[PDB]
Structure 1
Amino acid sequence: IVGGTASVRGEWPWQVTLHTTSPTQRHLCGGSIIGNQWILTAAHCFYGVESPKILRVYSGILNQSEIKEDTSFFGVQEIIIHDQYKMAESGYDIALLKLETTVGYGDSQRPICLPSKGDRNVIYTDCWVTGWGYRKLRDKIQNTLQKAKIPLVTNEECQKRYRGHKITHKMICAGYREGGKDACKGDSGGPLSCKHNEVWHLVGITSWGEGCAQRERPGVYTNVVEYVDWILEKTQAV
């Protein structure tokens, strides 16, 4: 996260850190708890991941230093990538992780509400991007979970900023015209959380951008409201 500040413990209890075990254990991506055996994240996170056996999901983490060999984690039973996914820049950058065990909810780990279909017309004015990603283009994964408040940008304005790309309504953009606050490397897959009527909603999934926090280059997020039926298809299968 560029231009953000340290989160307080329990502030984003749906935020997870997804680690890869191959060749050595390291943070891979962010993710969000959406159900008691379900993490919503970005499809591009699994580039070169040939098995869910190398993945570890850690919930209730503020600091990466809380993670050692004896730290409990959730194993991944299945990786579900959207069928239409090819690359982050073309959309459908969405994936689900079916956990091997159930998350026991508490003040440190609980789900974020998905947006409502009727709320496709609501204007969110209180949106935050979170993660352990870089604070600048050439940096390192941060110990403390960072947060940054970012304004949503219309599809029309985002398309103007990304000449040569096709910004679809299945993408949602967020950023300041002058730049300075954004997601960066290692934040992808994490949430863009917006508070509406005292309730947090998972509006976006950190997907891609041209560099980090650049002037007139808003962050591009998977527009979660456009995938609610797809999420229910995969999580509520009979």
Structure 2
Amino acid sequence: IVGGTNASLGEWPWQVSLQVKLVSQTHLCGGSIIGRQWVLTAAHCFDGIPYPDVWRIYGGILSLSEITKETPSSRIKELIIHQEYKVSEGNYDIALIKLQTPLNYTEFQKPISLPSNTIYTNCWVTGWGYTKEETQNILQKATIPLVPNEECQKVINKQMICAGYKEGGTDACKGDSGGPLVCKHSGRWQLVGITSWGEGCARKDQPGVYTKVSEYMDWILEKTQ
């Protein structure tokens, strides 16, 4: 995350860190709790490392230093990458992770509501990725305005969402992929976007791109059975 302030604990209980830890761990990507045994994240996070048993998932934390031997992790029972996703492009950048053991929610770990079709205000982003360019131990926060896609074009499908100041200076960078773009409306927080890609980490006029969760609901419901 870049352009943004440090994270209160409990403020974003749905945020998880996906880590691989082959022999030792490493935070590679973010994700969102959406169900007791379900995390939503970006397909491209698993390009280099599609091996599910190697991944480890941590929620309800703020400082990655808190993770230790006696820190319960979640495991991937099943990794469901969209079938149209292809490594060479940013289309269909979405993935469901079915957890091995269903979580028991707390003050610090709870799900996000999926979007059920409007004009969002108060949209936010989070993550453990650097500002500018290394990895931060403490989760981060920045507020951002949606950019209409048709303007976003400066190929961007109906399945994408864009956000960013075109003055620039706040966006997400590596390690923030698969993390959530959320919005606060009808009094309720919703998960509107999944961070996917943008050229650079936004500088000046480069809005970031996000998978648009609402247009993948059929998919998500289909795959959760």
TM bucket (normalised to shorter chain) is: over 0.9
Matches within 5 A, 1:28-43: 28-43=28-43
SS at match of 1:142: strand
SS at match of 2:105: coil
Per the alignment, residue 68 of structure 1 pairs with 68
For the 8 Å contact 2:182–2:192, the answer to whether it is kept is yes
- 1:13-43 Cα offsets, whole Å, 9 max, x none, are 0000000022531001000000000000000
Q: Decide which of 110, 118, 123 is 2:119's aligned counterpart.
A: 123
CA RMSD, aligned part only? 1.1
Matches within 5 A, 1:1-238: 1-87=1-87, 89-116=89-116, 120=117, 122-137=118-133, 140-160=134-154, 166-235=155-224, 237=225
Q: Where in structure 1 are there 5+ consecutive unaligned residues?
A: 161-165
Q: Where in structure 2 are there 5+ consecutive unaligned residues?
A: none
Task: Supply the AA of the counterpart residue of 1:135.
Answer: T
Q: Distance in 2 between matches of 1:88 and 1:204?
A: 21
For the 8 Å contact 1:130–1:148, the answer to whether it is kept is yes
- 1:151-179 Cα offsets, whole Å, 9 max, x none, are 0000111101xxxxx01110100000110
Q: Residue 184 and residue 221 in structure 1: after superposition, are their counterparts in 2 closer, same or farther (change >3 A)? A: same
For the 8 Å contact 2:47–2:87, the answer to whether it is kept is no
- 1:65-103 Cα offsets, whole Å, 9 max, x none, are 111222111111111000000137431000011000011
SS at match of 1:214: coil
Q: Distance in 2 between matches of 1:23 and 1:184?
A: 25
For the 8 Å contact 2:13–2:107, the answer to whether it is kept is yes
Mean Cα displacement is larger for which, 203-212 or 46-55? 46-55
For the 8 Å contact 1:154–1:173, the answer to whether it is kept is yes
Displacement after TM superposition at 1:51 (Å) = 2.0
- How high is the TM-score relative to the length of structure 1? 0.92
Displacement after TM superposition at 1:209 (Å) = 0.6
Identity of aligned residues (%): 64
User: How many residues are paired up?
Assistant: 225
- 1:93-151 Cα offsets, whole Å, 9 max, x none, are 000110000110121101000001xxx2x1111111100001113xx110110010000
Greater than 2 Å deviation, 4+ residue runs? 87-90
